[PDB]
Design a protein around this ligand. Structure first.
Ligand SMILES: [Zn+2]
Ligand SMILES: [Zn+2]
Lengths: 212, 212
């Protein structure tokens, strides 16, 4: 699958960098047991998506976008391994190869929950530290994207980017601020709290970021 | 992915049967949000693999092979859901749609381990009973296929299918029988126990079935 392939490629480039290897195409080809031509094809596709840039010396430099994605795949891999050894107790000799697949199906919601249920997510069972925890959020998701009712917590209001200041007090009345558990629902978006019902507007809807 | 697609189709046919619906192509198309033509294509491919037979009334009858596979996917789905609600504690409104992907990456080894770690695997969180536990083995794997050293347990010897009776006593000496924890290793296959080292031959290697 194209997506899964790219994710696998990005993770590979990440690993090599972490191991100290120069991410050269032939190295990635070897590690992924893919042929040079095949990887050139895939790498040539990643470039078109602004995911990687083949440096002047044929080394693959991950663009910020590609690295952000590569990181998320490492986090989903690592957490899968933590889950597999710690909870499931899968043979340590199977844990990694299995994780190589789980990283493509594990959602951020599951990841966040694993950060909860697991005793220690500092490193993977293989001693490689777990990246992207800050990015995972364990800032926040914008209400417009995160909002059926549900009770999240206000991570940020971002009143500073506001042009419309009418609902500032409407928020202050209901007592909605940073850390305020509130119940949202896209219908427009209305976030209730203190029995109060604050129906938001587009601008605030796009700037108020909440956590799960 | 072709395999994942077929697995998804087989599980769908299983579900419908379980719900009491007649597995008709248009029903599968609808449930999978696939088009009639696309499903006809995939179903036409499953036939070539002896996985399904389009009955005289256009209803898809799963061949024993297809059903055996369909079942394994239901087990891997169900156990994924049990894992997700019971251990991870994922929002029950996400559990199923997530599981629809996990069932394609979860291995029998993981399944067996989940049958261990989970409190109750009688039914899925959705009340549908978990099929294929007997087939999962929680008879056994043939030593030739299951055998680095590892200490499994003899599920069956199948001396009855033996033409060569030379190692019967060689086994009885080492005290290798049903329930005998032994250490195997393909080098040929040698299963040690009681300090004894019993190097097996092809015939017994293919008939002695052990569990993990
Ligand atoms: Zn790994
Ligand atoms: Zn389900």
């Amino acid at each position: 699958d194209l997506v899964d392939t790219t994710e696998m490629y990005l993770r590979t480039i990440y690993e090599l960098e972490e191991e100290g290897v120069t991410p050269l195409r032939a190295r990635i080809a070897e590690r992924l047991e893919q042929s040079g031509p095949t990887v050139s094809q895939t790498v040539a596709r990643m470039e078109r998506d602004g995911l990687v840039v083949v440096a002047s010396d044929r080394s693959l430099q991950m663009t910020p976008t590609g690295r952000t994605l590569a990181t998320a795949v490492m986090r989903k891999h690592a957490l899968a391994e933590r889950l597999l050894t710690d909870i499931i107790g899968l043979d340590i000799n199977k844990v990694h190869d299995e994780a190589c697949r789980w990283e493509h199906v594990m959602s951020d919601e599951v990841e966040r929950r694993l950060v909860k249920v697991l005793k220690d997510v500092s490193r993977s069972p293989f001693g490689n530290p777990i990246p992207g925890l800050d990015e995972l959020g364990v800032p926040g998701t914008r209400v417009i994207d995160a909002a059926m009712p549900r009770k999240v917590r206000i991570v940020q209001i971002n009143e500073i980017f506001q042009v419309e200041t009418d609902q500032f007090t409407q928020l202050l009345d209901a007592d909605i601020r940073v850390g305020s558990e509130v119940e949202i629902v896209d219908r427009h978006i209305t976030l209730s709290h203190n029995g109060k019902d604050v129906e938001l507007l587009d601008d605030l809807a796009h700037t108020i970021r909440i956590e799960e």
